[PDB]
Design a protein around this ligand. Structure first.
Ligand SMILES: [Zn+2]
Ligand SMILES: [Zn+2]
Ligand SMILES: [Zn+2]
Ligand SMILES: [Zn+2]
Lengths: 65, 65
């Protein structure tokens, strides 16, 4: 048997973090109070703008529906 | 670039076909007027009861959402 996964590539979009949040790639704070980084619309990964270029494109998550 | 796909295993459920439908595995008619076979709830594959055991479990479809 198998889980069902949604498999694609990340879809990053600038996001307004309402509390201090860290880059899921590098571990440093997403600096500032607005538009601090990007959140993947599909899997929720948070990255610095600069880290968008560093992450693997692979985007998967378990579909728990 | 990558499509987004849902990737899992088939989820077959007995189905009552309304019009003449063929087995997606073997090509023979799904005989009868009721419960003629099974349809995968995820990808729509149609199979005879006897062909359920013959198909690969892999179930994928492109999510066009
Ligand atoms: Zn993602
Ligand atoms: Zn970072
Ligand atoms: Zn299927
Ligand atoms: Zn068949």
């Amino acid at each position: 048997g198998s889980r069902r996964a949604s498999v694609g590539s990340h879809r990053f979009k600038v996001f307004n973090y309402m509390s201090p949040t860290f880059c899921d790639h590098c571990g440093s704070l997403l600096w500032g109070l607005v538009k601090q980084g990007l959140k993947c619309e599909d899997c929720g990964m948070n990255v610095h703008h600069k880290c968008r270029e560093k992450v693997a494109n692979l985007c998967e998550f378990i579909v728990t529906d």
